[PDB]
Amino acid sequence: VFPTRMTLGLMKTKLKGANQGYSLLKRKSEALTKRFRDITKRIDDAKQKMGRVMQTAAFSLAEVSYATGENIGYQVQESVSTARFKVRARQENVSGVYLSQFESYIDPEINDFRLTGLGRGGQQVQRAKEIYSRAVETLVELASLQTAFIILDEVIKVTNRRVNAIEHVIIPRTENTIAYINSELDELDREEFYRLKKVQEKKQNETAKL
């Protein structure tokens, strides 16, 4: 199976490796679970916050459309061919693992849209955009947290697997190998002493007797 001479040197450092590594993986799991509890609570809140911010804005948009006397949304879709509010990806280290985050930046491609001129009713549409540009921004910053949360869930599973793996497989494999080789190695040495001794008793006796 394995060497009967000096498996002890490689095996000794493995064994220590394993228990030391295990302790350490537990701290990394503890940190990952530590953050995980916190974000789960923050994310449920953030869902309602986004719901509301969209809804209050969404209703104002509905009101603006019926009061002026025409449906704007068609005209708005046609005018847009750039996305004003864009995002920049960045990695933030939360725990051991890096999560993906988004920081919105506003780029001045377009300011409003070239469709308002609906006389008196047109001021209702211009103002409607002002209220929505602010609402969308709340959603986007909150939306960043959602991304990290999915990323944490994927990592925890790899991490739970490792903590089990070390304890259950590695540590008893090191134990069985080290002890079995130790026991065979000492045996070779002991029998030799007995064989040297056995012939020396024969010698001693022969000398002694006349």
């Binding site: 199976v1 009967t4 697997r161 793996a165 497989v169 079995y180 065979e184």
Partner: protein, 205 residues
């Protein structure tokens, strides 16, 4: 000369086994884990070699079977299976590729159908080099067509459920007495070859 020896507690380094191994040119193994599931005798390829394997295949090729070509792929399959199994253990079956799943299944089948000589009715019946060759044509065929299929886009599940009957048949083939068309090629083994072909095609598109 076929000479049996015994390890001293899983220790193969005991003087008797090492000495006999010194003199031998062929080594055939015996794995404890595999005997517990009932597959004794249990010979793999990382505990066994034969120097005669090279000349022996040349002589079997002549007699009729395609054996040397199938022997090489067969060796590879077992050798990869062991390594792939260590990843299943530690990492899980989530780090695998689809072709590697294929290697795992075909392997499990080989473990049972050759190595096991344990009954279920009757202790297994005389299987020649000719019989043995047919089994190898069906396992090796299963593996090639299935990997092509996954490579070319296809479900794992579709492929394994579909082989189904063919797998039951090879398992139990050895219990049935040799000659069932001929010793050479049995009608029972001949027909599977068609079934794989029909399946491969359904799967692809």
């Amino acid at each position: 000369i076929v000479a049996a020896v015994s390890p001293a507690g899983g220790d193969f380094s005991d003087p008797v086994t090492t000495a006999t191994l010194g003199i031998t040119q062929v080594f055939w193994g015996l794995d404890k884990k595999l005997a517990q599931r009932k597959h004794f005798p249990s010979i793999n390829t990382s505990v066994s070699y034969s120097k005669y394997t090279n000349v022996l295949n040349k002589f079997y090729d002549s007699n009729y079977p395609e054996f040397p070509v199938l022997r090489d792929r067969m060796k590879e399959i077992l050798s990869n299976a062991e390594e792939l199994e260590q990843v299943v253990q530690l990492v899980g079956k989530s780090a695998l590729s689809d072709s590697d799943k294929i290697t795992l299944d075909v392997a499990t089948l080989i473990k049972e159908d050759f190595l096991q000589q344990n009954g279920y009715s009757t202790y297994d019946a005389f299987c020649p080099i000719w019989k043995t060759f047919d089994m190898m044509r069906a396992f090796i065929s299963y593996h090639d067509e299935a990997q092509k299929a996954v490579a070319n886009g296809a479900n794992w599940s579709k492929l394994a459920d579909s082989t189904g009957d063919v797998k039951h048949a090879v398992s139990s083939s050895k219990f049935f007495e040799p000659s069932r068309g001929e010793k050479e090629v049995h009608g029972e083994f001949e027909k599977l070859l068609s079934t794989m072909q029909e399946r491969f095609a359904e799967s692809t598109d």
